[PDB]
Write a protein that binds this DNA or RNA. Structure first.
Lengths: 107, 109
DNA sequence: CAACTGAAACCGAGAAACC
DNA sequence: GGTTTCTCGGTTTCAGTTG
């Protein structure tokens, strides 16, 4: 299970706008969830790229780039994981710069 | 899995929907009315019934709770038919240009 | 942006595929 | 036995058109 530490590292790194902590206990955090158009095209997908690079699912100069399945893989991994739970009453999919709110369960 | 095909077959066989009829004996091709809501020949009840029925069958719409939106129901069903491999539209036989327009669909086995 | 459209992006729920 | 991807069967948004 490499998702937990990986995500925490990426949030602490802060190389991703919109990706912030929600409390000084480092337990709840936002993640930008915007709908792609035909292309907000690369800066947002960086996470979805990073993950695909980390788990070796995308190798630069070997595979064809494909942001939709990167975002989908991360979505399915975050939904099916047990270390993360969506605070649905806190998510905000109905604004400009929308996001989803997640709590990190202790383990 | 696979609810749309059987559901539409039962709807066609139900006779509850005027204009929703088989067009051959083998039950392989069928006609489905396709009236534009903005026109005057449009009966709200009868012409939205099938779309509403699909939006009820899948729990997307709930009576008394949600607010009715016939155009969403229409778009939902149309995109669904387009996506599925069980249904193929026969564009040269659909007549979306008469006073009572309709689409025609063939059921692939 | 009223109703409508095709195409693409999107989604959850199992079922594999990994680990 | 423990996580992450893949598949399937539709659904919803995007960028326009009046189908």
């Amino acid at each position: 299970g490499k998702l937990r530490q990986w995500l925490i590292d990426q949030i602490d790194s802060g190389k991703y706008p919109g990706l912030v902590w929600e409390n000084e206990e480092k337990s709840i955090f936002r993640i930008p969830w915007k709908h792609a158009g035909k292309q907000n095209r690369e800066e947002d997908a960086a996470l979805f790229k990073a993950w695909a690079l980390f788990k070796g699912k995308f190798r630069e100069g070997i595979d064809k780039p494909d942001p939709p399945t990167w975002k989908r893989r991360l979505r399915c991994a975050l939904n099916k994981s047990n270390d993360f739970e969506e605070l649905v009453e806190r998510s905000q999919l109905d604004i400009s710069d929308p996001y989803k709110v997640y709590r990190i369960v202790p383990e």
